[PDB]
Copies of this chain bind each other. A is one copy, B any other.
Amino acid sequence: STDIQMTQSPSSLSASVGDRVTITCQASQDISNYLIWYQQKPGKAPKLLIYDASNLETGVPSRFSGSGSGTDFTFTISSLQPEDIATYHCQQYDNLPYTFGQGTKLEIK
C-alpha cells in the first residue's frame, strides 16, 4: 500500500475576528471517518480538536467543527477569535504511517 497523501488547503490565510474560517483536506485514498484536526501553537504540543472526522474533544469550543467522510473533509472555525490564531493540521489514522496535511497558518488581518 502506498502512503496516504493529505492535500490541505489553503496553506495560509488572513481573516478578521469573528470571521468564518474554512479549511479542507483531501485524502488520496478513502479513509472512512479516520481524520483528526489539530491546533498547533509555537513550541506547544499539537492539540487534538476533532476526531473521527466530526467529533469534538472534551472542552474544545463548539465553534470548531469537522465534516466529510471518505476522501473530502472540511474543518470550520465558525467565528475566529484571537486565541485561535495557530497552524491547523489534518491527520489520517486509517493506516500507518499516519500522515498529515501541510498545515494552514492563520493570521489576523
**Chain A interface (Cβ within 8 Å of chain B)?**
1, 3, 6, 11, 36, 43-46, 48, 51, 57-58, 89, 91, 93, 96-103, 105
A-B contact pairs, 5 of them (CB 8 A): A11-B43, A43-B102, A46-B89, A48-B98, A93-B98
Interface class of chain A by DSSP: loop
Copies in the complex: 2
B residues near A6, Cβ cutoff 8 Å: 45
B residues near A1, Cβ cutoff 8 Å: 58
With A and B bound together, what is the CA distance between A101 and B98 in angstroms? Answer: 16
Q: Is the CB of B51 within 8 A of A97?
A: yes
With A and B bound together, what is the CA distance between A26 and B27 in angstroms? Answer: 32
With A and B bound together, what is the CA distance between A46 and B87 in angstroms? Answer: 12
With A and B bound together, what is the CA distance between A48 and B46 in angstroms? Answer: 14
Q: Is the CB of B98 within 8 A of A36?
A: yes
